[PDB]
Amino acid sequence: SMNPPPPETSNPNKPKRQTNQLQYLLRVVLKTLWKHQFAWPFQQPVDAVKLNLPDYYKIIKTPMDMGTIKKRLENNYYWNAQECIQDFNTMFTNCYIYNKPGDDIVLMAEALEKLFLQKINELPT
Numbered sequence: 001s002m003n004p005p006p007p008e009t010s011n012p013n014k015p016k017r018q019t020n021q022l023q024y025l026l027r028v029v030l031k032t033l034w035k036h037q038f039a040w041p042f043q044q045p046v047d048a049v050k051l052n053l054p055d056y057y058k059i060i061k062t063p064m065d066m067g068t069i070k071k072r073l074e075n076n077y078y079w080n081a082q083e084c085i086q087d088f089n090t091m092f093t094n095c096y097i098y099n100k101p102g103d104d105i106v107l108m109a110e111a112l113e114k115l116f117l118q119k120i121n122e123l124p125t
């Protein structure tokens, strides 16, 4: 049930950038989603040893979570809003891939995805 190293939250040879949309993704999108009653499974990388999911990283090869996204936004790791939005979408699709329709955690990810899309529908200019 080995855990791989968590996804990087900095990369010295990757260029950094800051935009109004990336500041909004941290201040409004991430920090509001974080407080949702169903955010807690997604606030840190999946710990296969703690959670007893020894096949999690046998299935999920591009893991992602909101704790990683938060640190990436705080580091100015992303070039643009779309790069950050792809990490949220990877986090949701990983949940759907590892589990099955109707599972409690899938119902959680479905509700968070809807709220996420509602908030990114309109971004600052």
Ligand SMILES: Cc1nnc2ccc(N(C)Cc3ccc(F)c(F)c3)nn12
Residues within 6 Å of the ligand: 040, 041, 042, 046, 051, 095, 098, 099, 103, 104, 105, 108
């Ligand atoms: C499965 C699975 N797939 N991705 C993840 C991420 C986190 C995660 N935890 C914390 C355990 C858990 C199990 C069932 C749940 F209903 C739930 F809310 C949470 N489990 N999980």
